[PDB]
Amino acid sequence: RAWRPIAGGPGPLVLAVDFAATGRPEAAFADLVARLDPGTEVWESLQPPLGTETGMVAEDYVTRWEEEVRASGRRIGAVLGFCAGSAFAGELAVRLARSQPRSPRLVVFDPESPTTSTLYYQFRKVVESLAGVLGEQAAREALAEGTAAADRIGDVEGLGAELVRVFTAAGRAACAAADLDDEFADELTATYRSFVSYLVAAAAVDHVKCWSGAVAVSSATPTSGLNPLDPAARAALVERELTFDVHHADLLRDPGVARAVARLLA
Numbered sequence: 001r002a003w004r005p006i007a008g009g010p011g012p013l014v015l016a017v018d019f020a021a022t023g024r025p026e027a028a029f030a031d032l033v034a035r036l037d038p039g040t041e042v043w044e045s046l047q048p049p050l051g052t053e054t055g056m057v058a059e060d061y062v063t064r065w066e067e068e069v070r071a072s073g074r075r076i077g078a079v080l081g082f083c084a085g086s087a088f089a090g091e092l093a094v095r096l097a098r099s100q101p102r103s104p105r106l107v108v109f110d111p112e113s114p115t116t117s118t119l120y121y122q123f124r125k126v127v128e129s130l131a132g133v134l135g136e137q138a139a140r141e142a143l144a145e146g147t148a149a150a151d152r153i154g155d156v157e158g159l160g161a162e163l164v165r166v167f168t169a170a171g172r173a174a175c176a177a178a179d180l181d182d183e184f185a186d187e188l189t190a191t192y193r194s195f196v197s198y199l200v201a202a203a204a205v206d207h208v209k210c211w212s213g214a215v216a217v218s219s220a221t222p223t224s225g226l227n228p229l230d231p232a233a234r235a236a237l238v239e240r241e242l243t244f245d246v247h248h249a250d251l252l253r254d255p256g257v258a259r260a261v262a263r264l265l266a
Ligand SMILES: *[C@@H]1C(=O)N[C@@](O)(CC/C=C\C/C=C/C)[C@H]1O
Pocket: 019, 023, 024, 025, 026, 082, 083, 084, 085, 112, 122, 125, 126, 129
């Protein structure tokens, strides 16, 4: 299955696209849907079973999500995405505008098309967050190799593949230097692999095309979402941009965000 219901309803459906990962710093769509209008039915995107995302490009990710919606027979009233998930949200919304008589609304939250920079920064934060499970040695070497990779590999797909190599090697080193359990380590390295696969495929989406009709919801974190862009570039990229004085990591749990989103969906 490619979708998980996270809030019930009678009615048109809301899809929410994100990489589900307990332990990340950022609030999640569960935090937003808790604060939306009751009766809003919401499904959250599931990743392919661990390992089966090997061999999937962006087209395959989107078709997998889209075919399950087609099979369900349900109509989609809105597609939400957060961060890199906004890329896939936009593509699904464009495809549903073509397959449905009436187009869904598209709302993207701090939308990002992954770059070598965002990939590398997220890699560093994953490693730091897991320094205790990996041990100081495997974590130190992972950062050293990842920095070297970021210095030498200029493209997103290639950097992602190398960072996954590095992280996999760190997990395997932790099982033989820091006493990390072997099945927890396979899960850890497989989950990071799935995350990078998702990010690299998200980067392949034509985000200029698919965000042209999006309403963007923006935090105040200057490195997040549309915030690094020139003002004229932001206005050209999306149809509308609402701003909120909250951190990126709090955006989806903020009551003001939820109030505005409920009105966008009404
Ligand atoms: C951008 C995105 O696509 N997901 C994020 O929540 C980042 C998740 C990245 C890393 C988890 C790092 C944990 C220490 C959003 O920022």
